[PDB]
A paper describes a structure:
We determined a 2.8-Å resolution structure of the 70S ribosome of Cutibacterium acnes by cryogenic electron microscopy and discovered that sarecycline, a narrow-spectrum antibiotic against Cutibacterium acnes, may inhibit two active sites of this bacterium's ribosome in contrast to the one site detected previously on the model ribosome of Thermus thermophilus. Apart from the canonical binding site at the mRNA decoding center, the second binding site for sarecycline exists at the nascent peptide exit tunnel, reminiscent of the macrolides class of antibiotics. Unlike the ribosome of the Gram-negative bacterium Escherichia coli, Cutibacterium acnes ribosome has two additional proteins, bS22 and bL37, which are also present in the ribosomes of Mycobacterium smegmatis and Mycobacterium tuberculosis. Sarecycline (SAR), a third-generation tetracycline-class antibiotic with narrow-spectrum activity toward some gram-positive bacteria, including C. acnes, was developed for acne treatment.
Numbering used by the authors:
A (entry chain 1): 1 to 44
B (entry chain c): 2 to 275
Write the structure that this text describes.
Amino acid sequence: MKRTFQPSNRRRARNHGFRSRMSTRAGRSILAARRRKGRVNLSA
Amino acid sequence: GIRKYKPTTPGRRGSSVSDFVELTRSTPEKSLLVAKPKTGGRNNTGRITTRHIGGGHKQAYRIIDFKRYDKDGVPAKVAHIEYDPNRTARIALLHYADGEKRYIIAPDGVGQGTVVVSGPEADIKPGNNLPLRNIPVGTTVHAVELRPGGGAKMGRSAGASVQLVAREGKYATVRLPSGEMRMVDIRCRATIGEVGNAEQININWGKAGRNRWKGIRPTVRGVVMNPIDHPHGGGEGRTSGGRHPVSPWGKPEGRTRNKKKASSRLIVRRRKSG
RNA sequence: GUAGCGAAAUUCCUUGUCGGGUAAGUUCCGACCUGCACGAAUGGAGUAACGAUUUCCCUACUGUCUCCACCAUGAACUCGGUGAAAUUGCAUUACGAGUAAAGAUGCUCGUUACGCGCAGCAGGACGGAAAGACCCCGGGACCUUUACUAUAGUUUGGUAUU
RNA sequence: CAAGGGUUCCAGGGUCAAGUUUGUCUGCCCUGGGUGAGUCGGGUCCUAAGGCGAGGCCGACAGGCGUAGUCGAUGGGUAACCAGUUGAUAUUCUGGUACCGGCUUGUCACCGCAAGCUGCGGAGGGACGCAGUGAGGUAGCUCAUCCCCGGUGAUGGUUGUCCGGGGCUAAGUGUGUGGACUGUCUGGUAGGUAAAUCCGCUGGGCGUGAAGGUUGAGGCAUGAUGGGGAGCCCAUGGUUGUGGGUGAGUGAGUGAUCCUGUACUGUCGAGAAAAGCUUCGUGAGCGAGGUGGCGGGUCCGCCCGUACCCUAAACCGACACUGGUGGAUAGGUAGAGUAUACCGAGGCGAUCGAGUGAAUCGUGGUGAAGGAACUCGGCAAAAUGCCCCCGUAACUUUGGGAUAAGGGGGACCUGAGCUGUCGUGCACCCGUGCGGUGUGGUGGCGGUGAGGGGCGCAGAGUCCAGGGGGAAACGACUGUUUACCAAAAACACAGGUCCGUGCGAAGUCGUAAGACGAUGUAUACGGACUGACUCCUGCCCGGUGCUGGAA
RNA sequence: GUCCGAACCCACUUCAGUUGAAAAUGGAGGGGAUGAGUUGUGGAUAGGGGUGAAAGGCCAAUCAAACACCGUGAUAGCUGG
RNA sequence: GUGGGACUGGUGAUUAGGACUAAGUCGUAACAAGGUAGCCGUACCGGAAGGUGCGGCUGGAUCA
Ligand SMILES: [Mg+2]
Ligand SMILES: [Mg+2]
Ligand SMILES: [Mg+2]
Ligand SMILES: [Mg+2]
Ligand SMILES: [Mg+2]
Ligand SMILES: [Mg+2]
Ligand SMILES: [Mg+2]
Ligand SMILES: [Mg+2]
Ligand SMILES: [Mg+2]
Ligand SMILES: [Mg+2]
Ligand SMILES: [Mg+2]
Ligand SMILES: [Mg+2]
Ligand SMILES: [Mg+2]
Ligand SMILES: [Mg+2]
Ligand SMILES: [Mg+2]
Ligand SMILES: [Mg+2]
Ligand SMILES: [Mg+2]
Ligand SMILES: [Mg+2]
Ligand SMILES: [Mg+2]
Ligand SMILES: [Mg+2]
Ligand SMILES: [Mg+2]
Ligand SMILES: [Mg+2]
Ligand SMILES: [Mg+2]
Ligand SMILES: [Mg+2]
Ligand SMILES: [Mg+2]
Ligand SMILES: [Mg+2]
Ligand SMILES: [Mg+2]
Ligand SMILES: [Mg+2]
Ligand SMILES: [Mg+2]
Ligand SMILES: [Mg+2]
Ligand SMILES: [Mg+2]
Ligand SMILES: [Mg+2]
Ligand SMILES: [Mg+2]
Ligand SMILES: [Mg+2]
Ligand SMILES: [Mg+2]
Ligand SMILES: [Mg+2]
Ligand SMILES: [Mg+2]
Ligand SMILES: [Mg+2]
Ligand SMILES: [Mg+2]
Ligand SMILES: [Mg+2]
Ligand SMILES: [Mg+2]
Ligand SMILES: [Mg+2]
Ligand SMILES: [Mg+2]
Ligand SMILES: [Mg+2]
Ligand SMILES: [Mg+2]
Ligand SMILES: [Mg+2]
Ligand SMILES: [Mg+2]
Ligand SMILES: [Mg+2]
Ligand SMILES: [Mg+2]
Ligand SMILES: [Mg+2]
Ligand SMILES: [Mg+2]
Ligand SMILES: [Mg+2]
Ligand SMILES: [Mg+2]
Ligand SMILES: [Mg+2]
Ligand SMILES: [Mg+2]
Ligand SMILES: [Mg+2]
Ligand SMILES: [Mg+2]
Ligand SMILES: [Mg+2]
Ligand SMILES: [Mg+2]
Ligand SMILES: [Mg+2]
Ligand SMILES: [Mg+2]
Ligand SMILES: [Mg+2]
Ligand SMILES: [Mg+2]
Ligand SMILES: [Mg+2]
Ligand SMILES: [Mg+2]
Ligand SMILES: [Mg+2]
Ligand SMILES: [Mg+2]
Ligand SMILES: [Mg+2]
Ligand SMILES: [Mg+2]
Ligand SMILES: [Mg+2]
Ligand SMILES: [Mg+2]
Ligand SMILES: [Mg+2]
Ligand SMILES: [Mg+2]
Ligand SMILES: [Mg+2]
Ligand SMILES: [Mg+2]
Ligand SMILES: [Mg+2]
Ligand SMILES: [Mg+2]
Ligand SMILES: [Mg+2]
Ligand SMILES: [Mg+2]
Ligand SMILES: [Mg+2]
Ligand SMILES: [Mg+2]
Ligand SMILES: [Mg+2]
Ligand SMILES: [Mg+2]
Ligand SMILES: [Mg+2]
Ligand SMILES: [Mg+2]
Ligand SMILES: [Mg+2]
Ligand SMILES: [Mg+2]
Ligand SMILES: [Mg+2]
Ligand SMILES: [Mg+2]
Ligand SMILES: [Mg+2]
Ligand SMILES: [Mg+2]
Ligand SMILES: [Mg+2]
Ligand SMILES: [Mg+2]
Ligand SMILES: [Mg+2]
Ligand SMILES: [Mg+2]
Ligand SMILES: [Mg+2]
Ligand SMILES: [Mg+2]
Ligand SMILES: [Mg+2]
Ligand SMILES: [Mg+2]
Ligand SMILES: [Mg+2]
Ligand SMILES: [Mg+2]
Ligand SMILES: [Mg+2]
Ligand SMILES: [Mg+2]
Ligand SMILES: [Mg+2]
Ligand SMILES: [Mg+2]
Ligand SMILES: [Mg+2]
Ligand SMILES: [Mg+2]
Ligand SMILES: [Mg+2]
Ligand SMILES: [Mg+2]
Ligand SMILES: [Mg+2]
Ligand SMILES: [Mg+2]
Ligand SMILES: [Mg+2]
Ligand SMILES: [Mg+2]
Ligand SMILES: [Mg+2]
Ligand SMILES: [Mg+2]
């Protein structure tokens, strides 16, 4: 059937992209937390 | 007028439609249109603040001159009478005798070719716009300004009518279509005559679809909701509200006008009653 | 408690009573009113048309049935290849009448039974799957209100702005 | 093709793993290779929804909103086609022939408070719904005694039209047939943010009763002496390609979902924006007496994508999963059809098999007599089914009910006449040299056919394809709903009533500013209940609520 | 918001499946099919909140208050060890 | 034979009014100004006669 994940690169980049995260202070703190943890992927 | 539909199909059975006899032109003036995207009843916060709004046929806004006093003394010919989807009245397209074209609410009785004018020395004819000090007492006007220079705000819908009853001092007393008696500044402008298309209220839409493309979404009455959704919600089987009638937000029925504002200019309340 | 309607999606008694339909009708349709406990915009009574709605009947039609038979196929079955699953205290795991935590393969007294497989059927192992939802007790959640205590909001007056 | 995937694509080597079996094979592994654009799809251009937002306003802080702006396609704008080639790429490379923008150059013509260029805006334009019919075309398709290239048949016949195949070419340019568009010459001018000679609004003169002009469905010409297109050659090389051998390009029928066409007609629910573009000036600067125009020549033309899968074994579903996935093309015969049956272009034989008349389960098939006796219940199945013609009840809101019900005919052979269209041809208007027009043609093709006839159990012979009637309850109706046990009598609904709201509306979101309501104004808006329509809607204000009043 | 009927959308009945081909489907029928239709792309509304032709429905395969992390080794007169 | 209509008779639980009969019950509506003049059409109301509104009539009258 139609499943939950329907990919769209533009929507993904607008939602979880680096600039989207940098727009708000919550996203900036998320990037900081991922940097502290050591993720190689800071954002989508 | 109104044209009654024949009962060929259900939903067309009791319905009716205006015959559009007064329209002289089936297209609008291109230079007086702006885009009017739909809101769906949503706020600038993106939430529904006015319910029951959405969908409907696409519409283009017609720029209506509700001031009329920046063309004082310039006669205009009523070039056309045409349809405005944004209102229950018709719109008269006016060709001023200087090249400027404009739109007004079409007064009842005016048609293609008649000459309208604005100003204190304007003649008292339907469609002419004058200050209230110059409009004679006992006259039926429309498109009345609350504050001088603010533009038309009262008596604008189809068939609307305002009665000028007195001009004592620096205030003119007007009976609004609600029947309320109100005082306004004599310098406030008004257009002679009443609004046309007065018979549109008798239109039977006869069809859920016609309001659906008029832009009205279905209305779910609160008594068939759940208690979390509406104070009238709940109950086993069909019930009443289980309480006195209230709004979906728990506000009891009652007068809601702010008792302390411009009440010093209201002579008597509308007196709907029964 | 009016018009209207009434054993009704409402009638407990109840398969009320009478009438129609059937060879036979607790359902049905028309009546009666004795309305346990109808009723007029939480609308009353009707209503052509509409309905994958509910109910009754007639006709046509048939394997629905009397009453099943036969045919072909995908599994099943045999051979070669590949190869799981839930479950699992144990094992060389009968029946009868008993007995016992009151329903026994396992205890008593008897009876029967050579060892091991294959295809099958589901009576039992209180079979498997889900720390019963029903019930109660403890906790929680959400909902309600003329429960308590508060509060946003709305409103009153004072005072500052004055 | 898009989305998504990301090297799966190609060649060679490999068979541990993966593949529901095997495997020499692979979408697997290993190595190397493969994607070429001024025109295609995006960016360099434009805006929609929406996002962000200099200042700004609002908010203890954090922040909210928003102006000027600036982004943002799913839309607007925008110049190229055919053929050929590779193991893998092709509106990209190559061939042929075009187009667009620059730079530069040759030549001709022209300007000069007064060139031009660039900014800046004005106006025009871009620019818009839904539904329907018809007309003129073309694509396509069919047929052919016509033109080509073959064939003469394993078994009776098969050298005449008997059989098979083919009967082709683009963008661009020119032409201007249908069709469409369009009076002309001057004057004035409260408007178009600064202006306008470009617009708008108005005054006159003349004016066919259309005549020119402008335009451009197709056709023709050109592009094209080219390209493409079968079987004959010493030969090739023997699952091969080379050089010659390419032959034809006819006519009719039928006919679009395409073109004219945003046409035309109908219609209420009244159907984006902005830029490019044309023109107008000048609220800006540049700029010399140098530019700007029309034909001709040279060079310059950027970035990203381009392989491959893609109604799927490569995407979304943990799988190489009977599921889901937007768009384009979509031939023949029977048919109303994009249904269905069998076929075409093309692609597949499906990723464990071999057997064997067990019971049994699934999936189909048939059935004597009976025909709902089954069962909670006609559940399932059967019957009915198509077209044409005849005919059709209670009731009704006059529309319906209705395909009511209930009947007849259908295919095959032959076939008189009637028609669609074309036709060499007759005469004729000819504006002929018109790409024409009306009479008019033995005929070809197609459609339709009264009548007559044949055969069978059966002629809508297969697939496909309503059972019908009577009555009651509920809801008027079409719709909507518990994704994953309830589709209903529930919700909605059109209609109705009451209450609120005089506009900074009430109401709602928010701390606020603001916003929706609404660029609406009481014939409106918000809330409540009721729920088409018909006839109606009684009595009670004590209680509670609401409204008003204030001793 | 006509009728019959494909695509398309739906999900009424039945059978099968129910360690499925499939964490909701398949076969046979069935409803809508010019409309309150359906669908693509992008966008908006966010957790006591959204949205809801209203079923407490839906909000990333279990919603009478999502998910993740944190307070946190919550607490449990209860069950187990 | 089959099918769908047309017309019509009997019958029908139940129900409606009509006629007649107790010398039944309930009121007194009309006939006199019948004790509210009567009646006509219509409307609503009421156990029942009737009551009332609107318009009309004299087949009523007071007072002239
Ligand atoms: Mg998801
Ligand atoms: Mg314009
Ligand atoms: Mg925001
Ligand atoms: Mg509403
Ligand atoms: Mg509107
Ligand atoms: Mg409910
Ligand atoms: Mg509540
Ligand atoms: Mg309630
Ligand atoms: Mg109840
Ligand atoms: Mg009974
Ligand atoms: Mg009972
Ligand atoms: Mg009986
Ligand atoms: Mg009442
Ligand atoms: Mg009530
Ligand atoms: Mg009730
Ligand atoms: Mg009702
Ligand atoms: Mg009813
Ligand atoms: Mg009915
Ligand atoms: Mg239904
Ligand atoms: Mg029978
Ligand atoms: Mg088998
Ligand atoms: Mg085996
Ligand atoms: Mg015992
Ligand atoms: Mg025993
Ligand atoms: Mg024993
Ligand atoms: Mg022992
Ligand atoms: Mg065994
Ligand atoms: Mg077995
Ligand atoms: Mg057993
Ligand atoms: Mg058990
Ligand atoms: Mg359970
Ligand atoms: Mg337990
Ligand atoms: Mg549980
Ligand atoms: Mg508690
Ligand atoms: Mg919970
Ligand atoms: Mg105060
Ligand atoms: Mg004060
Ligand atoms: Mg790629
Ligand atoms: Mg590789
Ligand atoms: Mg790979
Ligand atoms: Mg490969
Ligand atoms: Mg293997
Ligand atoms: Mg290999
Ligand atoms: Mg290989
Ligand atoms: Mg730019
Ligand atoms: Mg914007
Ligand atoms: Mg700032
Ligand atoms: Mg820009
Ligand atoms: Mg952009
Ligand atoms: Mg390729
Ligand atoms: Mg090519
Ligand atoms: Mg080339
Ligand atoms: Mg412009
Ligand atoms: Mg427009
Ligand atoms: Mg022979
Ligand atoms: Mg041929
Ligand atoms: Mg001017
Ligand atoms: Mg100016
Ligand atoms: Mg045609
Ligand atoms: Mg490529
Ligand atoms: Mg490719
Ligand atoms: Mg494909
Ligand atoms: Mg698949
Ligand atoms: Mg996968
Ligand atoms: Mg055909
Ligand atoms: Mg097919
Ligand atoms: Mg083929
Ligand atoms: Mg394929
Ligand atoms: Mg496989
Ligand atoms: Mg066997
Ligand atoms: Mg059968
Ligand atoms: Mg037989
Ligand atoms: Mg039989
Ligand atoms: Mg028989
Ligand atoms: Mg029979
Ligand atoms: Mg029976
Ligand atoms: Mg029985
Ligand atoms: Mg059935
Ligand atoms: Mg059948
Ligand atoms: Mg009919
Ligand atoms: Mg029939
Ligand atoms: Mg014949
Ligand atoms: Mg027949
Ligand atoms: Mg057929
Ligand atoms: Mg009834
Ligand atoms: Mg009943
Ligand atoms: Mg319904
Ligand atoms: Mg209804
Ligand atoms: Mg329906
Ligand atoms: Mg829906
Ligand atoms: Mg469900
Ligand atoms: Mg309404
Ligand atoms: Mg307000
Ligand atoms: Mg606003
Ligand atoms: Mg209701
Ligand atoms: Mg009282
Ligand atoms: Mg009361
Ligand atoms: Mg009070
Ligand atoms: Mg329809
Ligand atoms: Mg689809
Ligand atoms: Mg269901
Ligand atoms: Mg089952
Ligand atoms: Mg229908
Ligand atoms: Mg988004
Ligand atoms: Mg509930
Ligand atoms: Mg979910
Ligand atoms: Mg909670
Ligand atoms: Mg909620
Ligand atoms: Mg703590
Ligand atoms: Mg603990
Ligand atoms: Mg325990
Ligand atoms: Mg009788
Ligand atoms: Mg009396
Ligand atoms: Mg009397
Ligand atoms: Mg009375």
